[PDB]
Amino acid sequence: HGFQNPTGPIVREVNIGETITVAELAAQMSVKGAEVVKFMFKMGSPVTINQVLDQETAQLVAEELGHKVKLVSENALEEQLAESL
């Protein structure tokens, strides 16, 4: 069980709330914020470092960069106590 040097890139489990600042999105993918800003500039909508993004854009860009998105909701108990009846 020794060290096997990884070959491919890295993938993270990006947890996305109801909204997220692009700084936190860059933090959770282990990429620098400037790279995320330049990437969004390359395709359409420009951003700033502390601009707030919504579910659709954040999930689309994060899943495009290769990471797996695991989004969550702020009313969890409400659906929890809705499949019980």
Residue numbers in the entry: 248 to 332
Task: List sentences quoted exactly from the publication behind this structure.
IF2 is the guanosine triphosphatase (GTPase) that guides the entry of the formyl-methionine initiator tRNA (fMet-tRNAifMet) into the peptidyl (P) site of the ribosome. In the small subunit (30 S) initiation complex, IF2-GTP holds fMet-tRNAifMet in a specific orientation and provides anchor points that accelerate joining of the large subunit (50 S), resulting in the formation of the 70 S initiation complex (70S-IC). Ribosome-stimulated GTP hydrolysis in IF2 and inorganic phosphate (Pi) release is accompanied by a series of conformational changes in IF2 and the ribosome, leading to the accommodation of fMet-tRNAifMet into the P site and IF2 dissociation from the ribosome.
Local refinement of this region yielded a 2.8-Å resolution map of the N2-globular sub-domain of IF2 interacting with helix h16 of 16 S rRNA. An initial model of the N2 sub-domain was generated with AlphaFold237, and then fit and refined into the density. Using this approach, we traced 85 additional residues (248 to 332), of which residues 266 to 312 form the three-helix bundle sub-domain N2 in IF2 not previously included in the E. coli 70S-IC structures. While structure alignment of the three-helix bundle N2 sub-domain of ribosome-bound P. aeruginosa IF2 (residues 266 to 312) with the NMR structure of the E. coli sub-domain N1 (residues 2–50)38 reveals reasonable homology with a root-mean-square-deviation (RMSD) value of 4.9 Å, alignment with the N/G1 domain from the crystal structure of ribosome-free T. thermophilus IF219,39 shows an almost perfect fit with RMSD of 1 Å. The overall shape of the N2-globular sub-domain complements that of helix h16 in the shoulder region of the 30 S subunit, with residues Ser277, Val278, Lys279 and Arg259 forming the main interface and the extension that emerges from the N2 sub-domain wrapping around the minor groove of h16. In the rotated 70S-IC (II-A), the buried surface area by extended IF2-GDPCP is ~5146 Å2, of which ~1173 Å2 is attributed to the N2 sub-domain. In the 70S-IC, the additional interactions provided by the N2 sub-domain further anchor IF2 on the ribosome, explaining how this region of IF2 stabilizes the binding of fMet-tRNAifMet to the P site of the 30S-IC and promotes joining of the 30 S and 50 S subunits. The region of the N-domain of IF2 proximal to the G-domain that interacts with the 30 S subunit was previously called the N/G1 domain in T. thermophilus IF222,34, and shares high sequence similarity with the distal region of the N-domain of E. coli and P. aeruginosa IF2 (sub-domain N1).
